[PDB]
Design a binder for these strands. Structure first.
Ligand SMILES: [Mn+2]
Ligand SMILES: [Mn+2]
Ligand SMILES: [Mn+2]
Length: 301
DNA sequence: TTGTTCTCAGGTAC
DNA sequence: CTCAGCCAGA
DNA sequence: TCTGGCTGAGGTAC
DNA sequence: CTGAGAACAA
């Protein structure tokens, strides 16, 4: 029974809350006693270009494996005993998926007894229902009804870095604008996205951080922070703990520090725009229009 | 001239 | 993200 | 009859 | 997730 470091668990709870899954399934299975088999699985999903992160997870947790599904990969942990040991330690730090973890533990503990009685089995299946209801469930087919065809500041920053590495965004932008001396306005943004159903979580962010705002559009919400001074301070505290977006955070800090110098010279303004390009290059950028090359059309002004 | 607020939306990476 | 599923081994 | 390794995909929530 | 851009506020 491996005992995990708290700082590792704190960051991982954040990352799990963002991009991880705690899943309970009822597999139809003829060779099983009650014609169904229970499956409990912990997943962390991540783009394959970042599978080193998931490979590190296997080493750190000490069990489980990584699979590759084309463009995306997953760390997977299914083995019941290590799964129980792991989730028991992760769950005090989970914020969004804590109940799921607790229910999966409850299930694992009643497994022996749930395999000896149809009554017990069915009840355990309703707990699976509860986990699926807590999850962002979409394509669930087999339910328990189907079965009823039986006959401190640092701690906050570690967690937050995990959530940021998973569901957050560190954004640098060059926005075209005639009124600006160099016809462009630099823009820096820290963002955390979450479906509006869960904006209570983003509301907490505003409180614990002290600055920033929550915005809604369609059915998703963002926590955003754009003010240069608070952003510099915030990202200075955060970046030691980031693993996926640390380089972006440092580039944003380096940009902020050079804003004075950038706003006086045309060659330094361009140079800073190339730092913006670098951030976008590190991000999973898809719809970028204005690059530094665009700004290089300053060869008129 | 600049910083910032506020909302929307493309294309995946969950 | 969160399901769906098959197969080999004991 | 049970378990764990392994594969494929629908529909958003990033 | 990570862009876009119109408009308010200095
Ligand atoms: Mn998420
Ligand atoms: Mn992510
Ligand atoms: Mn995500």
């Amino acid at each position: 029974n491996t005992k995990y470091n708290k700082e590792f668990l704190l960051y991982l709870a954040g990352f799990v809350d963002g991009d991880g899954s705690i899943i309970a399934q009822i597999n139809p299975n003829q060779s099983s006693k009650f014609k169904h088999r229970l499956r409990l699985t912990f997943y962390v999903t991540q783009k394959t270009q970042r599978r080193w992160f998931l490979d590190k997870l296997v080493d750190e947790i000490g069990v489980g494996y990584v699979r590759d599904s084309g463009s995306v990969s997953q760390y997977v942990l299914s083995e019941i005993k290590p799964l129980h040991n792991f989730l028991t330690q992760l769950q005090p730090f989970l914020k969004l998926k804590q109940k799921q973890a607790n229910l999966v533990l409850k299930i694992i503990e009643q497994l022996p007894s749930a395999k000896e009685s149809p009554d017990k089995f069915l009840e355990v299946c309703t707990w699976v229902d509860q986990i699926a209801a807590l999850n962002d469930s979409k394509t669930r087919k087999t339910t328990s009804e189907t079965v009823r065809a039986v006959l401190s500041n640092k701690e906050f920053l570690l967690y937050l870095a995990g959530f940021v590495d998973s569901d957050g965004s560190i954004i640098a932008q060059i926005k075209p604008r005639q009124s600006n001396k160099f016809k462009h306005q630099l823009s820096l943004t820290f963002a955390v996205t979450q479906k509006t159903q869960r904006r209570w979580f983003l509301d907490k962010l505003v409180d614990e951080i002290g600055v920033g705002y929550v915005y809604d559009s369609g059915s998703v919400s963002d926590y955003r922070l754009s003010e240069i001074k608070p952003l510099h301070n915030f990202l200075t505290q955060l970046q030691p703990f980031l693993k996926l977006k640390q380089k972006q955070a440092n580039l944003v800090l380096k940009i902020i520090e050079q804003l004075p110098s950038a706003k006086e010279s045309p060659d330094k303004f361009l140079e800073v725009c190339t730092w913006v390009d670098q951030i976008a290059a590190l991000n999973d950028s898809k719809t970028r229009k204005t690059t530094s090359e665009t700004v290089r059309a300053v060869l008129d002004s």
